[PDB]
Design a protein around this nucleic acid. Structure first.
Ligand SMILES: Nc1nc2c(ncn2[C@H]2C[C@H](O)[C@@H](COP(=O)(O)OP(=O)(O)OP(=O)(O)O)O2)c(=O)[nH]1
Ligand SMILES: [Ca+2]
Ligand SMILES: [Ca+2]
Ligand SMILES: [Cl-]
Ligand code: NA
Ligand code: NA
Length: 326
DNA sequence: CGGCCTACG
DNA sequence: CGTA
DNA sequence: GCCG
């Protein structure tokens, strides 16, 4: 089993779901305390289990697996022997974990803001609503829409939404295209938000496009919240039987020269892309982001026409999106 | 021990 | 600071 | 928390 997640296929569904979900609780709790290193180790250990071909049934089967040291191994052992890990359950019911999770789920609130509110004594959404001068415009929108935004977006919702975006994009710039990215491109049947990548086949024509798209969506009454730019993090009105619901939608524009890098980055998963960028820099000496792949010794950018090109540049076997669920 | 992804709004 |  |  290789040490980087980008070196192994990771399917969406697998054979160690309960074990991985426990390690991801500990990863999340580490993030809430500001230890990104521990978060990464727990995430990586969880992802190793997702990549295995069958269930872990005995502690012996962790020997030699990367990212399983004394702590992650003890978590798995307790789950194998008792069906529960006391450390995980203590985290689950802790006031700190529950409130930090509640607050960071608000659009416009990160770990740093949630922690400050926690230290001030706040614990509930109604606590926040009773002091709204304390809130940015973004946070106000995230709090007002929190209930709808907490409900998963169904893959069955997405095609009708993509059609609406395509209509606005085609008026803004005929010939421009819309590609579904994010977890839905990896095969998920639900998601917390929808991610779209927009480009045009003629290099340079995409300049200035996103403000034109947003203006047209707003004029159609579809934008509940937004605001030169190339990424937009929106709240959209999605139809429902007899009504509608708020949904988070991300829009990104890339020039066609960069489209394979943007498609790769925005298709994720988040851990897969962090691991891929870490691999590129530490193992290959190349710097990767959603715009390109840079050789800092030649001071040259790799041209890519496809995601396949990028995997080849990096010396990695190609993984389709459905196998990037690290 | 150092390092832990890398951007844009 | 927020966001992907 | 773990790798190298
Ligand atoms: N490099 C990098 N990419 C990120 C980061 N956060 C998100 N992304 C990329 C990869 C994600 O798959 C993609 C979309 O992010 P989302 O939060 O929408 O996640 P995703 O669609 O995978 O899942 P979800 O909507 O929760 O089902 O953006 C980050 O911190 N770093
Ligand atoms: Ca998103
Ligand atoms: Ca998403
Ligand atoms: Cl840490
Ligand atoms: Na080990
Ligand atoms: Na948030």
């Amino acid at each position: 089993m290789p040490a980087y997640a980008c070196q192994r296929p990771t399917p969406l569904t697998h054979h160690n779901t309960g074990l991985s979900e426990a390690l991801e609780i500990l990863a999340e709790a580490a993030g809430f305390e500001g230890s990104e290193g521990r978060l990464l180790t727990f995430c990586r250990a969880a992802s190793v289990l997702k990549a295995l071909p069958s269930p872990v049934t005995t502690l012996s089967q962790l020997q030699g697996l990367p990212h399983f040291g004394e702590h992650s191994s003890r978590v798995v052992q307790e789950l194998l022997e008792h069906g529960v890990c006391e450390e995980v359950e203590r985290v689950r019911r802790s006031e700190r974990y529950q409130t930090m999770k509640l607050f960071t789920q608000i659009f416009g609130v990160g770990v740093k803001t949630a922690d400050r509110w926690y230290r001030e004594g706040l614990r509930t959404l109604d606590d926040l609503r009773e002091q709204p001068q304390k809130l940015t415009q973004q946070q106000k929108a995230g709090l007002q829409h929190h209930q709808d935004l907490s409900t998963p977006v169904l893959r069955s919702d997405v095609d009708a939404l993509q059609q609406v975006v395509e209509e606005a994009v085609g008026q803004a710039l005929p010939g421009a295209t819309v590609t579904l990215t994010g977890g839905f491109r990896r095969g998920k049947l639900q998601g917390h938000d929808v991610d779209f990548l927009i480009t045009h086949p003629k290099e340079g024509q995409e300049a200035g496009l996103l403000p034109r798209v947003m203006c047209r969506l707003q004029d159609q009454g579809l934008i509940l919240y937004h605001q030169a730019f190339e990424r937009s993090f929106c709240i959209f009105r999605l139809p429902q039987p007899g009504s509608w619901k708020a949904v988070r939608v991300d829009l990104v524009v890339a020039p066609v020269s960069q489209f394979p890098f943007a498609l790769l980055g925005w298709t994720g998963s988040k851990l897969f892309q962090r691991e891929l960028r870490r691999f590129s820099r530490k193992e290959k000496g190349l710097w990767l982001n959603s715009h390109g792949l840079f050789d800092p010794e030649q001071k040259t950018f790799f041209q890519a026409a496809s995601e396949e090109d990028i995997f080849r540049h990096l010396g990695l076997e190609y993984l389709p999106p459905e196998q990037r669920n690290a």
